[PDB]
Amino acid sequence: APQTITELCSEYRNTQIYTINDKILSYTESMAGKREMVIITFKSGETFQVEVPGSQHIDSQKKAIERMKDTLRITYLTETKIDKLCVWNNKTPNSIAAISMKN
C-alpha cells in the first residue's frame, strides 16, 4: 500500500501535493442544503474544502468524508501543524484528498 502521502497521491488523476507546514488560520462548517461542507484557510492565502457527499461517492468514501471533517475541526482547535495536503487541483476550492501532520 502507499507508504507516504506523496506515494498515495501519485495514484490519482488530477492531484497535487501542497506543502503547507502551518496550523489552520480559519475554519468554516456549513450544514446548509447541498453545501454540507467544511472550508479551511491557511495564512498563505490557500483555501481548501472537504467536498460534499454525493452519489459519485462510493459508500466507504462517505465514511472517510466524515472523518476528514472531524480531523480538520480538532486540528484547528488544537492549533496543530498540517504538513502537506494532497488535493484534487481541478476543483474550486481544491478538494482535500489526504492530509499529513508531523512530529
Binding site: 466524515e66 472531524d70 480538532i74 482547535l77 488544537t78
Partner: protein, 41 residues
C-alpha cells in the same frame, strides 16, 4: 471573628476550583472523540 480567616480560605479555594475546571476544559477536551450517533443507534 476567626470566621474572617475561615471565609478567606473558602472564597480563595472557590476561586481556585473555578480556575481548575477551566484548565480541565482546555486539556481534557483534547481527548474528546465524537461519535457517529447515526451508525450506532
Amino acid at each position: 471573628g476567626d470566621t474572617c480567616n475561615e471565609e478567606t480560605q473558602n472564597l480563595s479555594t472557590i476561586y481556585l476550583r473555578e480556575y481548575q475546571s477551566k484548565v480541565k476544559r482546555q486539556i481534557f477536551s483534547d481527548y474528546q472523540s465524537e461519535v457517529d450517533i447515526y451508525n450506532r443507534i
